[PDB]
């Protein structure tokens, strides 16, 4: 920026105006502008070379939102330190940048770019006999690590609960570390032959994913995000099957456990006998040299009390020395407790799966000394055009709350007044209405609901099977095989126990009456529940995700952002004030002022042996 | 024959009950209840009262920022 007149609009632009630099005489084709200052990148998805950078950013930026047409990237340090991972230098880097920018790459860009790019790739930790060493390929690091503070050819031993510690250290000092495992060279660990059965069929994006993680020939540890029903499973089935050495499996249900087993035998010819389902009904462990344990959290990540049963289960998984965790659902691996099972258990590969890979606190972040940087992510839209994962009409209904309901909630404290603005008469009448109108569209419909009062009520009054927590984990599966087959039942009422993991490839509508206050990946899971539907490619099928709503309350403060994930990924809601052909509908649940009156009070009202025969 | 100088307030249920709400906290706000739908405020209080609605629906409302 030297002498650069300003323009008399320069003004509503703060220190904004990148007009201070010229533009190149190729910019018709370059389809990359990038902000000098806050390190955006607007991407041209409509020109020639989108395709080429799609995924190049994809590697050094994260993506901020991508819908039709400009897709919107940012580099940050931790996009930076995930792309610096997989075989990439600050030359390359710079020298694409600079190739697909229709502006010259500023200095300060370049700049963040130099600083984050070299330090991968110099201290390495090996786990031998589940002890964990810190080996390192040059003598001079020792001066580095022994001198560190923190810290306590040569390998040095280090605690295992400690290496939580270590690991975030090397990221403040110059190295950080990287867990790569040659599978190829390891006869210790004995090994089990499984291998994708010939009818299995690996789609494009899931062999991108797996090749971003074994590019080089050693599995690299990392996360791989792919859409609601992309086929996460089957990447983790290929990766396990590949390595070839005992993996365990963690996921965060009993349902969704249950899940895993069946896939990995359908997919695989992962023989029976070599699996063990750790959950909290059967607890009995492989006893073959070389098994698959597919388990939970909450039955793996537990500290105080264990029983006798399940304490012998504990004690085999941590004697052994795995070759492979895969993590499901990994955005609640960082949790204050769930990240301990990472440390105890001991592997020289972990993969995360999960859709959403966000969370409303900060931790977010640890994924990276957890488990590894993100190797790959995939579009939403992308897929859906495809074939791959169906196409919602997301929708908003705008239900007025009654003048009688409304009165209440002002006067009515915060707590409470959840209650009440969920349970408002005309979110009846709108569940009620398209209930009816798509069942009679041979549509298969799921309710959800994270307040289990309103669910219970809204069950009871439609005569429908409903599921929460206090379910045993048999009725809940035999509601959720007789929601898929059986024609008689065709909508349930989920809770937020459905709200991940759980697969429905007939679910083809959703609704939502309830909600977990401003979470924004609860919307994406629960939508991911109907992106699988199985009539997906028929002509003109569209899944429908509803989401009501009342008026002027704190619930649109909630459902607006709520919804700002799907946006970024593409997904446009559409505001429904007024569903046409509700009134002639026959019986409206509290139609006359006596029932929403009564309605209105009920919900209000919430808050010696000889001597035994004496008795 | 009787005229009242005055503000004719038409609005919908929800609004309505804002209004009473403020007219409670401030006595002089509503001279008198027409119908479900119409109100009859102050005209002083008019410039007041809509300014005061808006920001109470601003809690309702997510603003990112
Ligand atoms: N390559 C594939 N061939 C056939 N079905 C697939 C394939 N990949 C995924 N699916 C199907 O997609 C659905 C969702 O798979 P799942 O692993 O549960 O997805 P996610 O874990 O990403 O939500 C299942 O019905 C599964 O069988
Ligand atoms: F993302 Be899936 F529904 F596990
Ligand atoms: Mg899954």
Redesign the pocket.
């Known amino acids: 920026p030297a002498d650069f007149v300003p323009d008399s609009v320069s003004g509503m632009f703060r220190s904004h105006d990148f007009s201070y630099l010229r533009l190149r005489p190729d910019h018709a084709s370059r389809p990359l502008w990038i902000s000098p200052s806050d390190g955006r990148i607007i991407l041209e998805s409509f020109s020639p070379l989108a395709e080429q950078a799609q995924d190049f950013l994809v590697t050094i930026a994260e993506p901020i939102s991508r819908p039709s047409h400009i897709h919107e990237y940012k580099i940050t340090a931790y996009s930076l330190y995930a792309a610096v991972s997989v075989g990439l230098e600050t030359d390359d880097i710079i020298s694409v940048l600079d190739r697909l920018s229709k502006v010259p790459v500023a200095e300060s860009i370049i700049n963040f770019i130099k600083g984050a790019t070299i330090s991968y790739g110099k201290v390495k930790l090996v786990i031998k006999h589940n002890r964990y060493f810190v080996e390192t390929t040059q003598a001079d690091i020792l001066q580095m690590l022994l001198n560190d503070s923190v810290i306590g050819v040569h390998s040095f031993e280090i605690a295992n609960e400690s290496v939580e510690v270590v690991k975030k250290r090397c990221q403040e000092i110059d190295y950080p570390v990287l867990e790569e495992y040659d599978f190829r060279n390891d006869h210790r660990n004995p090994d089990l032959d499984i291998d994708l059965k010939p009818s299995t069929?690996?789609?494009p994006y899931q062999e991108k994913s797996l090749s971003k993680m074994f590019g080089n020939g050693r599995a690299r540890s990392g996360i791989i995000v792919?859409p609601?029903?992309?086929?996460?499973?089957?990447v983790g089935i290929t990766a396990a099957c590949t390595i070839k050495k005992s993996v365990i499996v963690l996921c965060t249900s009993s349902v969704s456990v249950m899940q895993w087993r069946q896939?990995f035998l359908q997919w695989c010819t992962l023989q029976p006998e070599n699996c063990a389902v750790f959950t909290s009904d059967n607890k009995e462990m492989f006893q073959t040299e070389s098994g698959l344990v597919v388990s939970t959290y909450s039955m793996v990540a537990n500290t105080r009390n264990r029983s006798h049963d399940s304490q012998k289960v504990m004690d085999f998984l941590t004697g052994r020395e795995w070759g492979f965790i895969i993590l499901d659902e990994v955005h609640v691996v960082p949790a204050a407790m769930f990240r301990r099972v990472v440390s105890t258990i001991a592997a020289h590969a972990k993969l995360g799966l999960t859709?959403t890979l966000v969370r409303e606190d900060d931790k977010i972040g640890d994924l990276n000394f957890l488990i590894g940087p993100k190797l790959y992510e995939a579009n939403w839209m992308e897929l859906s055009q495809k074939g791959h994962i169906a196409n919602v009409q997301c929708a908003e209904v705008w239900c007025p709350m009654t003048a009688e309901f409304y009165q209440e909630y002002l006067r009515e404290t915060a707590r409470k007044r959840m209650l009440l603005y969920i349970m408002n008469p005309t979110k009846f009448q709108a569940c009620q209405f398209l209930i009816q109108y798509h069942e009679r569209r041979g549509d298969k419909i799921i309710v959800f609901s994270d307040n289990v009062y309103a669910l219970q009520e809204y069950a009871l009054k439609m005569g429908k099977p409903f599921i929460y927590g206090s379910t045993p984990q048999q009725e809940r599966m035999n509601i959720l095989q007789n929601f898929q087959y059986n024609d008689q039942i065709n909508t349930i009422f989920l809770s937020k126990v459905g709200d991940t993991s759980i697969?429905l490839?007939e679910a083809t509508c959703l609704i939502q009456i309830s909600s977990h206050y401003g979470s924004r990946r609860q919307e994406a899971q629960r939508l991911?529940r109907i992106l699988?539907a199985k009539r997906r490619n028929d002509e003109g099928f569209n899944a429908f995700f509803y989401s009501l709503v009342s008026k002027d309350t704190q619930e649109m403060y909630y459902s607006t952002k709520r919804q700002a994930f799907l946006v970024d990924q593409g997904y446009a809601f559409k505001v429904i004030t007024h569903l046409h052909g509700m009134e002639n509908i026959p019986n409206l649940a509290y139609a006359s002022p006596r029932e929403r009156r009564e309605l209105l009070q009920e919900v209000l009202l919430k808050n010696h042996p000889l001597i035994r025969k004496m008795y | 024959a009787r005229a009242r100088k005055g503000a004719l307030v038409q609005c919908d249920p929800s609004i309505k009950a804002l209004i009473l709400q403020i007219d409670a906290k401030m006595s002089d706000i509503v001279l008198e209840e027409l119908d479900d739908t119409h109100l009859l405020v102050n005209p002083s209080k008019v410039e007041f009262v809509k300014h005061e609605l808006n920001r109470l629906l601003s809690k309702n409302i997510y603003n990112p920022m």
């Open positions: 069929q690996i789609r792919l609601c029903g992309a086929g996460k499973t089957l896939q859709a697969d490839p991911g699988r």
